[PDB]
Design a protein around this ligand. Structure first.
Ligand SMILES: O=C(O)[C@H]1O[C@H](OP(=O)(O)OP(=O)(O)OC[C@H]2O[C@@H](n3ccc(=O)[nH]c3=O)[C@H](O)[C@@H]2O)[C@H](O)[C@@H](O)[C@H]1O
Length: 582
């Protein structure tokens, strides 16, 4: 592709007024041949950018100028208002006729759903040096987010479920390694790697270089997922392949919110009941939260309305131009009617509106503290869905079903002091255990237990509780619907799990009657279709498990403490354990 002639032309083009990238060729020979490998390689990098980005590096620069101008002003809409199509989901912890009806319809729809996991983001802000999807959902079983999503999708959509994972340079190799180590076998998985974009050293959009003198690169945002899907093939486009196989929905999830497996079925059912082409997953928002709001927008006067996510800072500002909050918070679990999604994809080529958000070094000088780059957000695909021919709404769920692992222990302490959500590894794990319990009680399991915390973390800033710990695998519990849970416990009044107990269940298991004071693993057939291992009149007493806090005083020569332990601030002591197999 890279003719020496085209590379000179592009070099010429980039030095023209309005592009002005002369500072890249300081001290260079007049023509390409006279250039060395190191320089000829920089030109090549610039050139090849064309097949990563529409219009290549020249268009990228121009887009930068336009965005740098745009973002010096006040993003102001002419009109802002409650989205018309908002729907309240019933509680996840009450087995009402509605909830049953919605879980049943949504669970059937799961058979015809494409799943998309965005997992290109860095996990350091947490102070976790591995990929986020390798974090455990809980440390009782240590099941990773990656396994958790994939096993659930294969359970509800069958082994051949279509699944996409977006990775980036940061997470990609480690993602393939984790798939391999978990012995996950997902025949229709596509791993699509997002490419990095160039960075701007300054307000005039001059490209930045790193230490080795190479074009500096940063991520373009989770927005990339649409174009990556648009371009992927199986000579046939991926999406054509989905449509032709009968798939009817597509859902996008983020990398560490276990709540998605509970909200999705309900969202699907409501997308169907209310004919939604795009359905944002929401929770009631607290005025301070670092979370976007679902709004009905009108950019400039007389413009059509658009239902889109918008950030708070923008919301305060725009309100100035002209119960938690009238407006819902979008958690970025996005549920689409597939045909509608494909239409918008084909027409846009998966390209969505962009922005830039430079972090300056001053409130004063237009000087960047660090190079900026153009970004995009995957939810902004909503902008391409006009109110004329598409129905875009949101479903509001209980805040509790939103359980991301976003913050370090130190961030969470500060957040909690300001009255906000910690959303850290400790409260992620705790919320997961609590979620199982609330669900199981909803079908009549009699769980009595203290609301008091059992360990404190973050230098005594706040506490969590973990027990009783009850974890059912996807063979055991299937989709996790209330009905599916009731098949595991068909006579729940005879199952007595004490507040300090641990119950781990794997495989085809039915528990009719049990008294548990301690820790127990019950294993049944790994085959979903095999004859179940049935437990009746079991009585199990042992020392069980405990949890304790990681003490300030940490050794680093002979400790088996990992980052996984440290980011939550406690460890489970797995002191004893009864096993029932067969
Ligand atoms: O959770 C929320 O409640 C918010 O999520 C969003 O905020 P964010 O600030 O983006 O935070 P963050 O956790 O970093 O990235 C999210 C995902 O994309 C992935 N991701 C990210 C960047 C990227 O370049 N590639 C990628 O795959 C990454 O791997 C992860 O899975 C919505 O925009 C916001 O409206 C709100 O819904």
């Amino acid at each position: 592709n890279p003719s020496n002639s085209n590379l000179q032309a592009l070099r010429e083009e980039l030095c023209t007024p309005g592009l002005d990238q002369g500072h890249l060729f300081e001290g260079w020979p007049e023509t390409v041949d006279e250039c060395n490998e190191r320089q000829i390689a920089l030109l090549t990098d610039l050139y090849m950018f064309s097949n990563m980005y529409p219009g290549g590096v020249a268009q990228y620069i121009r887009n930068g100028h336009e965005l740098l101008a745009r973002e010096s002003e006040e993003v102001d809409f002419a009109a802002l208002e409650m989205p018309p199509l908002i729907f309240e989901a019933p509680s996840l912890h009450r087995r009402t006729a509605e909830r049953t009806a919605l879980e049943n319809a949504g669970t059937a729809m799961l058979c015809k759903t494409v799943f998309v996991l965005v997992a290109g983001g860095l996990g350091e802000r947490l102070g976790y040096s591995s990929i986020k999807v390798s974090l455990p959902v809980e440390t009782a079983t240590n099941t990773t987010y990656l396994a958790y999503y994939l096993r659930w999708a294969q359970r509800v959509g069958g082994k051949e479920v279509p699944f996409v994972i977006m990775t980036s340079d940061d997470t990609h190799d480690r993602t393939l390694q984790l798939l391999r180590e978990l012995q996950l076998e997902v025949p229709n998985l596509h791993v699509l790697k997002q490419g990095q974009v160039f960075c701007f050293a300054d307000s005039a959009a001059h490209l930045a270089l790193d230490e080795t003198g190479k074009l500096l690169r940063k991520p373009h945002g989770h927005g990339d997922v649409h174009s990556l899907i648009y371009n992927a093939t199986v000579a046939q486009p991926l999406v054509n392949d989905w449509l032709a196989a009968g798939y009817e929905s597509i859902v996008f999830i983020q990398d560490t919110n276990a709540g998605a497996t509970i909200t999705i079925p309900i969202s699907l059912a409501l997308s169907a009941e209310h004919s939604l082409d795009m359905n944002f997953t929401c929770i009631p928002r607290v005025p301070k939260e670092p979370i976007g709001l679902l709004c009905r927008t009108k950019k400039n006067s007389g413009d059509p309305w658009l239902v889109a996510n918008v950030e708070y800072n923008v919301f305060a500002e725009v309100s100035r131009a002209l119960g938690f909050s009238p407006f819902p918070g979008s958690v970025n679990t996005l549920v689409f009617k597939l045909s509608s999604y494909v239409d918008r994809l084909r027409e846009s080529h998966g390209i969505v509106p962009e922005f830039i958000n430079p972090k300056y070094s001053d409130e004063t000088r237009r000087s960047f503290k660090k190079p900026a780059r153009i970004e995009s957000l995957m939810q902004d695909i909503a902008l391409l869905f006009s109110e004329d021919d598409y129905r875009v709404g949101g479903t509001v769920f209980e805040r509790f079903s939103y359980q991301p692992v976003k913050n370090s222990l130190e961030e969470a302490a500060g957040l909690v002091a300001q009255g906000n959500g910690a959303y850290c590894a400790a409260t992620g794990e705790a919320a997961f255990y609590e979620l199982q319990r609330r669900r199981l009680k909803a079908i009549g399991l009699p769980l009595f237990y203290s609301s008091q915390p059992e360990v404190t973390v973050a230098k005594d800033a706040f506490g969590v509780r973990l027990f009783p710990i009850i974890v059912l695998d996807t063979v055991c519990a299937s989709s996790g619907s209330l009905d599916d849970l009731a098949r595991v416990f068909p006579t729940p009044e005879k199952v007595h799990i004490d507040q300090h107990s641990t119950l781990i269940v794997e495989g085809r298991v039915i528990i009719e009657s049990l008294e548990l004071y301690g820790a127990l693993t019950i294993r049944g057939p790994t085959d979903s279709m095999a004859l179940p291992h049935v437990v009746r009149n079991a009585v199990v007493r042992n020392a069980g498990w405990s949890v304790h806090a990681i003490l300030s005083l940490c050794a680093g020569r002979d400790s088996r403490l990992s980052e996984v332990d440290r980011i939550r601030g406690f460890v489970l002591k797995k002191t004893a354990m009864a096993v029932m197999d067969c």
